Structure formats: C-alpha cells, structure tokens
Amino acid sequence: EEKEILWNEAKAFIAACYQELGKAAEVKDRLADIKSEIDLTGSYVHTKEELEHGAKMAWRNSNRCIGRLFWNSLNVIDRRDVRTKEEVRDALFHHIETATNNGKIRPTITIFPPEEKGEKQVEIWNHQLIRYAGYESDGERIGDPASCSLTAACEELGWRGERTDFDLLPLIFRMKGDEQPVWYELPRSLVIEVPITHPDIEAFSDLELKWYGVPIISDMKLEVGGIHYNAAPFNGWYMGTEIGARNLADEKRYDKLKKVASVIGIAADYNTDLWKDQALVELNKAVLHSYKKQGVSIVDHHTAASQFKRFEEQAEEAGRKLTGDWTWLIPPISPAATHIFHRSYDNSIVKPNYFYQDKPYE
Amino acid sequence: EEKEILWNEAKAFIAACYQELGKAAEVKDRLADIKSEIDLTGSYVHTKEELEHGAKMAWRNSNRCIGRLFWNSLNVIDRRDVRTKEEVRDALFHHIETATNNGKIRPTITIFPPEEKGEKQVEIWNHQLIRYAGYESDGERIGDPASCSLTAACEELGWRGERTDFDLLPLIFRMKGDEQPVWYELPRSLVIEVPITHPDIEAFSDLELKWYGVPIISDMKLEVGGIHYNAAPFNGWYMGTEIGARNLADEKRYDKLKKVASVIGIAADYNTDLWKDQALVELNKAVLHSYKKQGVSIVDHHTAASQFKRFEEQAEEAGRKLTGDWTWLIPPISPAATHIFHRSYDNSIVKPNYFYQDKPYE
Ligand code: HEM
Numbered sequence: 001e002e003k004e005i006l007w008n009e010a011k012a013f014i015a016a017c018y019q020e021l022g023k024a025a026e027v028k029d030r031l032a033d034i035k036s037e038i039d040l041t042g043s044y045v046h047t048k049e050e051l052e053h054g055a056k057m058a059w060r061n062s063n064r065c066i067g068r069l070f071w072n073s074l075n076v077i078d079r080r081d082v083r084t085k086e087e088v089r090d091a092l093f094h095h096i097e098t099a100t101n102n103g104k105i106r107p108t109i110t111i112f113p114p115e116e117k118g119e120k121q122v123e124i125w126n127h128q129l130i131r132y133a134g135y136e137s138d139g140e141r142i143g144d145p146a147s148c149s150l151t152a153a154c155e156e157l158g159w160r161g162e163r164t165d166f167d168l169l170p171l172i173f174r175m176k177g178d179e180q181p182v183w184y185e186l187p188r189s190l191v192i193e194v195p196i197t198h199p200d201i202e203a204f205s206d207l208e209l210k211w212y213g214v215p216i217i218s219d220m221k222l223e224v225g226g227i228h229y230n231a232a233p234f235n236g237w238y239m240g241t242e243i244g245a246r247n248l249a250d251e252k253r254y255d256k257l258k259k260v261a262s263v264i265g266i267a268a269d270y271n272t273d274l275w276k277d278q279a280l281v282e283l284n285k286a287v288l289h290s291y292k293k294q295g296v297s298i299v300d301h302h303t304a305a306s307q308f309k310r311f312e313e314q315a316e317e318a319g320r321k322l323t324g325d326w327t328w329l330i331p332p333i334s335p336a337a338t339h340i341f342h343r344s345y346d347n348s349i350v351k352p353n354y355f356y357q358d359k360p361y362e
Numbered sequence: 363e364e365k366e367i368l369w370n371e372a373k374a375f376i377a378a379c380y381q382e383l384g385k386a387a388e389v390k391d392r393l394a395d396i397k398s399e400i401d402l403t404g405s406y407v408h409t410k411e412e413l414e415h416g417a418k419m420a421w422r423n424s425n426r427c428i429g430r431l432f433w434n435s436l437n438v439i440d441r442r443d444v445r446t447k448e449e450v451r452d453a454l455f456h457h458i459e460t461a462t463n464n465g466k467i468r469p470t471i472t473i474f475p476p477e478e479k480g481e482k483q484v485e486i487w488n489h490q491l492i493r494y495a496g497y498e499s500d501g502e503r504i505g506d507p508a509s510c511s512l513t514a515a516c517e518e519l520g521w522r523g524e525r526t527d528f529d530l531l532p533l534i535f536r537m538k539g540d541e542q543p544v545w546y547e548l549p550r551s552l553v554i555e556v557p558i559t560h561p562d563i564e565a566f567s568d569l570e571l572k573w574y575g576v577p578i579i580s581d582m583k584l585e586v587g588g589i590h591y592n593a594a595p596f597n598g599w600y601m602g603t604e605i606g607a608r609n610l611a612d613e614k615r616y617d618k619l620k621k622v623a624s625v626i627g628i629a630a631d632y633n634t635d636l637w638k639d640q641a642l643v644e645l646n647k648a649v650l651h652s653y654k655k656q657g658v659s660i661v662d663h664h665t666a667a668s669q670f671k672r673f674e675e676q677a678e679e680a681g682r683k684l685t686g687d688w689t690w691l692i693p694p695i696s697p698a699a700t701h702i703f704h705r706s707y708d709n710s711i712v713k714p715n716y717f718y719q720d721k722p723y724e
C-alpha cells in the first residue's frame with residue numbers, strides 16, 4: 001500500500017520553506033530525517049515552524065483571495081494534539097474568541113491533526129464556524145437558503161432552530177471511529193453580530209438586517225508538503241461586498257434588494273432606472289458604516305484592491321511569481337474601478353494551498 | 363505559393379451555412395464549383411447569401427458580445443464592388459446614415475472586398491467610424507486619451523483638430539497601391555450626439571458631457587470560410603455601461619467620476635463612502651435617461667443580460683453549442699446582479715468570427 005508521492009511533495013516544500021526562513025543549510029538533514037520517517041511510518045510530521053509557514057504560504061498561493069497582502073501575519077494555532085470531541089469543540093470555541101478579539105479581528109487558523117491513511121481524524125461539517133440556518137418547507141422560506149442542506153442534517157440529529165431569519169447553526173463535526181457527528185450550540189457571548197444601519201437613511205433599520213462579525217471558513221483542506229489537513233478552519237475580516245453584494249443581495253440568498261429600494265425611496269419597476277445598482281451601493285455603504293460604527297474590522301473593496309496591488313508589487317520584489325484568479329479577484333461592485341479588472345492573472349495552482357473537499361453530508 | 367488551407371475552411375463553412383439555410387442538397391455542387399475556382403484563381407467568391415449569413419454566424423460566435431440575441435437580423439451591406447477612395451468614403455458615409463436611422467439604430471455591417479493575397483484592398487485606420495480625438499502635449503490632456511496615437515497620425519497627414527474635448531476624428535483609410543491613406547472630415551449632419559443630463563439632478567448638465575449615438579467598430583477582420591474581410595465595419599446600439607462605466611469613467615479615458623461626485627453632492631474623500639460606486643450609478647442612470655429622452659437606441663445591462671439568457675436558451679433549442687467569454691460578458695456595473703456572473707462559459711473560438719488585426723499606424 002505504498003506509492004509514496006508524499007516524498008516528492010516533501011522535497012519541494014521543505015526546500016522552499018527553509019529557503020524563505022533562511023534555514024537553507026538545514027535541508028539535507030531534515031529531508032533525510034523525513035525519508036527514513038516515511039519508510040518507517042508511511043508519513044512524516046511537520047515542525048512547529050514548517051506548519052506555521054506552510055499555512056502562510058498556502059494563503060499566499062490562494063489565487064481567489066484579494067486580501068493576501070497580510071499573508072505573513074497569519075496567526076497559526078497548532079492543535080494537532082487534540083484527541084476528543086470536547087477538545088475539538090473547545091479549540092473551535094477558542095478560535096472564535098481569539099479571532100474576534102473584541103472586534104479587532106486577527107487572521108487566524110487552527111490546525112487539527114491531518115489525514116493519516118487518507119482517513120480523517122476530525123471531520124468538520126460546518127461551512128463556516130458561524131453561519132445562519134436556512135429553512136424551506138411548503139412555500140415558506142426562512143433564513144439563509146445556502147444553509148438548507150446543513151440545517152436539515154443538524155435537525156435530523158436532534159438540533160432544532162427557532163426559525164428566525166438568523167438562527168446560529170451549531171458547531172457540528174465527526175470524530176474518527178464514530179458513525180455520527182456531534183453538535184454543540186454556539187454560546188451567544190462568543191458571536192459578535194452587527195445590525196445594519198445607514199449613515200443618512202434612518203429608515204434603513206426597518207429592514208432589521210444583521211450579519212456576523214467574523215467569517216471562519218471551516219470546510220477547506222490545507223495541504224502542506226503532501227500532508228492533508230482536512231480540518232483547518234481559517235478566518236480573516238470581511239470585505240464589505242461579500243455581505244452587501246452577495247450574502248444579503250443574491251436572489252438565492254437573503255434577496256433584499258427590493259426591500260432596500262423601498263426604504264431608500266426609489267422605485268423598483270424599470271431596469272433603466274438602475275434601481276438594483278443604486279440599492280446595491282446604498283446597502284454596501286450601510287454594511288461598512290455599520291461594522292465601523294460597532295468597531296468590528298472590515299475593509300471596502302477599493303482599499304482591498306489597493307492592498308492587493310501592493311501584494312503584487314511585494315511578490316515581484318521577492319522574486320516570486322504571482323498567481324491569481326481574475327474571475328474571483330474582481331469585486332462584484334464597480335470591478336472596473338479597480339486595477340485588478342484591467343490586468344490579467346496566471347491561474348496556476350502552487351502548493352501549499354487550500355482546496356475544496358466533498359461535503360460529508362447530503 | 364499554394365498550401366491552400368482555404369479549401370478546408372470552405373468545406374466546413376459551406377456545409378454548415380447551407381445546412382442552416384435549408385440548402386443542404388446544393389452543397390456538393392457548390393463545393394465542386396469552389397474547388398475548381400480555388401485551383402484556377404487561388405481563391406473563391408462568396409455568394410450574396412453565404413456572405414450575409416456568414417456575417418450573421420460571425421456575430422453569433424463572438425464570445426465577448428452580450429447582445430448576440432439579435433444575430434439573425436443583422437443588416438448586411440455588400441460593397442465588394444468598391445474600387446475607389448470616393449466609393450469607400452461614400453459607403454462609410456452611407457453606413458453611418460442607415461445605421462443611425464434617425465436614432466432607431468439598425469445593427470448593420472458594410473463588407474468591403476477581402477484580402478486577395480493576404481494583401482488588403484481597403485485598410486481602415488479608424489477604430490470606430492465615429493470617435494473623438496485625443497491630445498496630450500506638455501501636461502495638458504484634451505479629449506479621449508485612447509485616440510492619442512490615431513489623432514497624432516491624422517495630424518501628421520494634414521488634418522487639424524479644434525482641440526475641444528469632443529473633436530470628431532476624420533475617416534482615414536488607405537487603398538491598395540497607395541503609400542499613404544486619405545482622410546475625410548465627417549459631416550456634422552451624419553453624427554448624432556447625446557448631451558448627458560440627469561433625470562433628478564439638474565446640475566448634472568454643468569459637466570457638459572456628451573457621447574456619440576452609434577458605435578461602429580471598424581478595425582476588426584471578419585473571417586468567413588477562409589476568406590478574410592479585413593475591412594468590414596459593423597455596429598449595434600450601445601449598452602449604457604460602455605459609456606457611463608468605461609468611456610467616461612476610466613482614469614485612462616475621460617476620468618469623470620470625481621466631477622460626477624461633486625455635482626451629485628457627495629464627498630470624494632473616503633473609500634468607505636463608496637463615492638466612486640455611487641457616482642458610477644448616477645452617471646450610468648444619466649446616460650440611459652439621456653439617450654432615451656433623445657430617442658437614440660440604447661440598452662441597460664440588466665435588459666441586455668435578460669436578452670442574452672434567451673440567446674443561451676435559443677442556442678440550446680437549435681442544438682448549437684454556446685460559447686462565450688465570461689470575463690467580457692459580465693457588465694462592469696453590478697455583475698453579480700446578472701445570471702451571467704453565476705454560470706460558466708466555454709471560451710472556444712468557432713468560425714465564422716471577428717478577429718483583432720494589427721493597427722496599420724504607430
Ligand atoms: C484578512 C482578511 C481577508 C479578506 C478581506 C479576504 C478577502 C477574500 C475575498 C473577498 C475572497 C472571495 C470571496 C468570494 O467572492 O467568494 C477570498 C477568497 C479566499 N480567501 Fe481570502 N480574505 C482574507 C483572509 C484570508 C485568510 C486568512 C485566508 C486563509 C489563510 C484566506 C484564504 C482565502 C481562500 C482560500 C479563498 C477562496 C475560497 C474559495 O475558493 O471558495 N483569506 N478572500
């Protein structure tokens with residue numbers, strides 16, 4: 001049951017990782033330690049510093065991420081020591097608290113034990129650690145339609161949501177050996193939320209909109225040197241358009257543009273009035289104003305594109321090729337007002353990186 | 363000097379073209395007529411109906427065009443008979459008048475004689491038949507910066523612009539055999555223009571903005587059945603975003619967003635105010651309102667995307683594969699508010715089509 005492709009990925013990663021850390025001389029000894037270890041166990045264990053740097057490199061190589069400028073300040077939390085459900089839950093609880101940081105969000109990743117045989121040690125079911133539930137029974141739609149399948153899986157396992165439009169989903173994850181996952185309700189004190197108000201339009205609060213403070217992606221596999229960390233939730237702060245132009249605007253999500261147009265006092269009858277466009281701008285202005293007024297970190301898409309330009313420049317000075325996905329880097333609001341729109345990007349996949357993986361639920 | 367690749371393209375085009383026109387039985391005789399003609403002359407001549415349909419197929423295959431729904435109603439003008447400069451000029455004059463149609467714009471293409479030896483019979487220098495000049499001498503920028511190189515080439519040949527921000531460039535084209543092109547000033551009576559006003563903000567006219575009515579692309583090569591029509595100017599009507607989000611908004615074009623923000627009474631100091639976004643929407647609302655109030659055909663990007671969805675559906679019912687360039691089909695204003703954003707497109711190049719070609723000037 002060999003065919004160890006892992007040896008080749010380890011040679012590539014350790015060489016580059018130690019190259020960047022100045023530890024270039026330490027490479028031949030460490031690869032020797034690794035090759036024996038691969039022969040004795042079929043795998044190898046990253047150090048402390050390889051793991052932290054590999055997670056940073058993976059953010060740096062994420063073609064679709066516009067916020068990559070701060071890749072080197074990612075806060076890496078090593079929890080490869082976890083063995084029980086309560087330790088997994090507590091680590092996820094801790095990630096939320098330390099990432100939130102009373103609103104001064106810290107880009108943070110918690111790294112759980114990797115896949116051993118390709119067998120998961122911890123299998124997280126949440127798309128994000130904090131997300132709202134979605135319901136969809138006979139005509140009536142409640143909450144976030146994107147969470148319908150996960151919300152159904154949770155309720156099939158004993159959980160029950162109050163069926164508000166913003167029910168917090170529980171943490172749900174399965175351990176190795178168990179046939180079923182466990183779920184834990186989120187403590188309200190850990191979850192910061194932001195009511196959406198408008199700086200000029202006082203009636204905007206009548207929409208009773210809100211979103212959570214911290215997006216913590218928890219369904220992606222971090223791959224470092226051939227080691228597959230399927231459970232490694234990470235977070236940054238939001239870019240405003242993610243909330244105002246997608247989460248609250250998409251017809252398959254909260255679909256609020258019609259109601260936004262009514263409270264800002266414009267008609268929603270004619271395409272040539274550009275009412276969707278106007279409502280999108282006022283809603284996105286409201287999201288930024290609301291997060292800033294509360295003291296929760298956020299960035300607008302113009303500032304974010306300015307930072308990403310410096311990431312482009314910084315990559316060229318370091319002699320690293322830049323990779324990116326143009327179709328994901330452009331913002332969904334005024335993309336041509338950013339430099340990203342007016343250049344091209346090589347969409348090559350460089351490792352370490354973060355990758356999609358099949359949902360465990362149906 | 364053979365290596366006739368032309369025979370293969372003719373077999374592919376005539377088969378498909380006659381297939382769609384119901385003339386499937388007439389194919390073997392016509393290809394026989396073509397193969398002899400290729401052997402006798404090194405080329406072949408399209409019919410009347412092959413030419414008109416091939417130009418329509420070429421529009422249908424333009425991956426970057428969102429307005430392809432009306433491909434079958436393209437008005438094809440056959441001027442392969444032209445031989446002199448005055449006949450070329452008159453045909454271009456006529457194209458402008460009949461395409462404009464007092465504001466009820468007709469999608470029209472005028473097809474000049476194709477390349478014979480790869481040698482052009484008529485070589486058009488204009489990017490569009492109607493475009494504004496651009497100037498750029500010691501600090502001072504006037505007009506459309508995108509036209510600077512062409513405006514310089516025209517003035518090097520005796521033309522002189524009044525150096526307003528909206529100088530109409532002359533028609534400029536070279537005939538086969540001449541070392542130099544000729545240029546002809548555009549008659550003002552042929553060119554409809556639209557002053558940009560706002561439906562609600564009366565001060566918007568203080569910006570003194572305007573654009574021309576009809577975009578007539580004149581620098582692309584139409585390829586049909588291996589025959590290269592390098593001179594075949596075509597036109598549709600504008601999509602509003604082309605004017606309000608690019609021509610008047612780009613920093614490398616008319617760069618008006620700052621002045622738009624001032625007349626609509628918002629500050630242009632903070633990114634988080636989304637002032638560029640708001641100004642872009644009000645400017646694009648103004649463009650649509652202005653063209654509609656004048657009676658000049660235009661379409662908004664929402665209506666245009668709705669039409670393109672029906673083009674997608676119509677393509678599937680006809681059993682034709684759909685091709686498209688996602689990065690060009692999405693509008694630059696609220697792209698995620700259109701279905702285009704939320705699906706993918708195969709960017710394969712199918713012929714007949716329109717292709718870029720090297721500018722003749724420096
Ligand atoms: C610091 C704040 C951050 C901002 C503002 C930011 C911004 C974004 C945005 C706007 C997207 C595209 C979202 C979409 O349109 O679906 C994105 C994608 C992504 N970001 Fe970041 N990001 C940040 C931090 C991070 C961090 C810390 C990581 C991981 C180490 C990361 C990895 C990614 C990945 C993997 C994707 C693509 C996910 C996918 O394919 O669905 N980002 N980022």
Ligand code: HEM
Binds near residue numbers: 428429
């Ligand atoms: C009927 C009105 C039409 C509308 C509203 C329309 C709309 C558009 C738009 C918005 C673009 C992209 C422009 C850009 O972002 O640079 C485009 C590209 C294009 N359209 Fe159309 N179009 C129309 C008619 C036509 C016609 C009649 C033809 C030719 C038969 C045509 C062929 C093309 C081509 C070739 C491109 C790509 C040009 C390039 O690569 O630079 N379109 N169209």
Ligand SMILES: Nc1cccc(CCCCNCc2cccc(OCc3ccc4ccc(N)nc4c3)c2)n1
Binds near residue numbers: 217704706
């Ligand atoms: N602050 C932060 C911080 C860290 C990370 C992020 C972004 C993570 C979001 C995960 N994302 C999941 C997903 C997968 C598949 C489709 C999705 O839908 C949204 C979307 C976005 C861009 C598109 C571009 C082109 C196209 N055709 N579709 C798109 C769909 C989301 N944010």
Ligand SMILES: Nc1cccc(CCCCNCc2cccc(OCc3ccc4ccc(N)nc4c3)c2)n1
Binds near residue numbers: 344597604689
């Ligand atoms: N009503 C109508 C009717 C008929 C045809 C048209 C469109 C013709 C416009 C010709 N176009 C020339 C051109 C060439 C190269 C760059 C240009 O710049 C604009 C642009 C547009 C989309 C982009 C998408 C991605 C990206 N990276 N850059 C883009 C640049 C224009 N309109």
Ligand SMILES: [Cl-]
Binds near residue numbers: 215242
């Ligand atoms: Cl999100």
Ligand SMILES: [Cl-]
Binds near residue numbers: 577604609
């Ligand atoms: Cl244009």
